[PDB]
Amino acid sequence: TGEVQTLTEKIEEAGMPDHVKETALKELNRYEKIPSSSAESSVIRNYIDWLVALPWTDETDDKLDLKEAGRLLDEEHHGLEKVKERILEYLAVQKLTKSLKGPILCLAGPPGVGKTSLAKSIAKSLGRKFVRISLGGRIIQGMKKAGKLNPVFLLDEIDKMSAMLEVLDPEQNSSFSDHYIEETFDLSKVLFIATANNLATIPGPLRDRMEIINIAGYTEIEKLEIVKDHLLPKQIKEHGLKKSNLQLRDQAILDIIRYYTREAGVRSLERQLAAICRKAAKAIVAEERKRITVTEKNLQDFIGKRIFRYGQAETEDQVGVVTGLAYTTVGGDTLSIEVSLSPGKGKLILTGKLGDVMRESAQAAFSYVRSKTEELGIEPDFHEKYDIHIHVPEGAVPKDGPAAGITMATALVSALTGRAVSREVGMTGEITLRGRVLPIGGLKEKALGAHRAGLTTIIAPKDNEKDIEDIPESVREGLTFILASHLDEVLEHALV
């Protein structure tokens, strides 16, 4: 007998068609079964097995029925309306181009918005097997974990990297190589997808090889529903217990959000849910009570005391201190710029991000007040006998640096004129020497996160109005958008 058949037999199997390989196959095969398992006989010994799984024949046969899919996406993700409309485009388009084409997409946005899930779900629809392949530091493995050559790889994180192009280049991806196994391989039918946050670290080379989709974040409204129709049941079922075991009243869910999560995704949200799913169960086993109802009063008896503040029931107006809406890699955020007055020379030194991008803007809001002075109420003998300190907290992403113009401006004035920025207002906008207010980036996410921390008024660029259209109903409804074109406009509304 001998194991000279156990392998060989399944080798000539229907699996393993291509002969370009079978050469190298029986080659290292008819090798040295002579002699026993020497230190040598253990080597190539294994080389054969990795080689046995690498799919060839098999390959999911695919179903592409939009009427479903599009509304299977609506079974496992709440909102993302616009993001789906673009997953289907990537299919209705697929169906025609019978062979998947180079442009493979990256999903981008704050973590916890569903990037990973959308993928799994893209694949559920295509009935291809799905594989996560983390790139925090090798497709080699990939296929194996799916012994079916028509998969969906999800290059999870391409941006926590320290060049691989070869693997995706439409021209080359067809013929695929890999050391320690050197032999071409066909990846024709392989739906590739990428996750990502800070679109920077991604290599320019790659970002062009790939088509991008942005998942955005979520309105209180949205989250809430995500909690009710997906998040909760999922955690219930996962902490093994019944829907009849624990229910949380809407208002409490809202509370969990406003007060224990200031994220744009829903990861923190999920975690606090579980907190309860957990607390819940220990009851169900001991007390045995078949039901547990967490309410807006109970909440503390589950997830602790409040964690973030929401609104102005606490804060109270300040001087030379404005709250600018900035575009963090992780959503809208509320970084506050400050300005301080110490005797000296016209020089101005700023802190925080070293910012060479900032100085330009700073010494412009500066170079504005330089002009229109008495007109603003401030001793013209100032740039001559004061020294101004500015602090611009890190977070805003590169493109959006100059979007803090009207902010530093507003502060520098509020600081010089002993006035006071209205704690309620959040602002964003680029400044010019003359005092012009130029267009800004991502007003959507900005006001989204402006609402999250619960501000009232949100001063922004006039030439940005056609951007308010796409701001989700719920938030555009709790905000009074003051639009402006020159400082004085901003100053009049943000100071008191």
Question: Binding residues for ligand ADP, per CB under 6 A?
Answer: 77-78, 111-117, 226, 230-231, 265-267, 270
Nearest to 412 by CA among 445, 380, 369: 369
For position 3 contacting its own copies by CB under 8 A, the verdict is yes
Give me the least distance between CB of 164 and its own copies, in Å please: 20
**Interacting partner of 117 out of ligand ADP, its own copies, none (Cβ under 5 to 8 A depending on kind):** ligand ADP
Sign of CA dihedral 339, 342, 347, 353: negative
Say how far apart CA 494 and CA 496 lie, in whole Å: 7
The secondary structure of 122-152, three-state, reads HHHHHCCEEEEECCCCCHHHHHHCCCCCCEE
76: number of Cβ within 10 Å: 14
Say how far apart CA 252 and CA 227 lie, in whole Å: 11
Question: Residue 479 carries which side chain, given as an amino acid letter?
Answer: L
Is-cis flag, bond preceding 35, omega within 30? yes
**Interacting partner of 266 out of its own copies, ligand ADP, none (Cβ under 5 to 8 A depending on kind):** ligand ADP
Burial of residue 259 (number of CB atoms within 10 Å: 0-12, 13-18, 19+): middle
Closer by beta carbon to ligand ADP, 150 or else 195: 195
**Interacting partner of 152 out of its own copies, ligand ADP, none (Cβ under 5 to 8 A depending on kind):** none
Closer by beta carbon to ligand ADP, 228 or else 249: 228
**Interacting partner of 472 out of ligand ADP, its own copies, none (Cβ under 5 to 8 A depending on kind):** none
Give me the least distance between CB of 117 and ligand ADP, in Å please: 3
Say how far apart CA 448 and CA 216 lie, in whole Å: 10
Say how far apart CA 335 and CA 206 lie, in whole Å: 32
Give me the least distance between CB of 142 and ligand ADP, in Å please: 19
**Interacting partner of 35 out of ligand ADP, its own copies, none (Cβ under 5 to 8 A depending on kind):** its own copies
Say how far apart CA 7 and CA 52 lie, in whole Å: 9
**Interacting partner of 27 out of ligand ADP, its own copies, none (Cβ under 5 to 8 A depending on kind):** its own copies
**Interacting partner of 49 out of ligand ADP, its own copies, none (Cβ under 5 to 8 A depending on kind):** its own copies
Cβ(459)–Cβ(406) under 8 Å?
yes
Q: CA distances (Å), 320 to each of 362, 395, 416, in order? A: 14, 20, 7
For position 6 contacting its own copies by CB under 8 A, the verdict is yes
For position 175 contacting its own copies by CB under 8 A, the verdict is no
Closer by beta carbon to ligand ADP, 198 or else 312: 198
Give me the least distance between CB of 30 and its own copies, in Å please: 8
* 178-217: contacts with its own copies (CB under 8 A): 182
Count of residues near its own copies by CB under 8 A: 15
**Interacting partner of 226 out of its own copies, ligand ADP, none (Cβ under 5 to 8 A depending on kind):** ligand ADP
Cβ(426)–Cβ(482) under 8 Å?
no
Closer by beta carbon to ligand ADP, 77 or else 262: 77
Alpha-carbon radius of gyration of the chain: 29
* 30-89: contacts with its own copies (CB under 8 A): 32, 35-38, 40, 43-44, 46, 49
H or E element at residue 369: helix 356-369
Give me the least distance between CB of 40 and its own copies, in Å please: 4
Give me the least distance between CB of 436 and its own copies, in Å please: 60
Cβ(280)–Cβ(292) under 8 Å?
yes
Residues in the site for its own copies, rule: CB under 8 A?
3, 6, 23, 27, 32, 35-38, 40, 43-44, 46, 49, 182
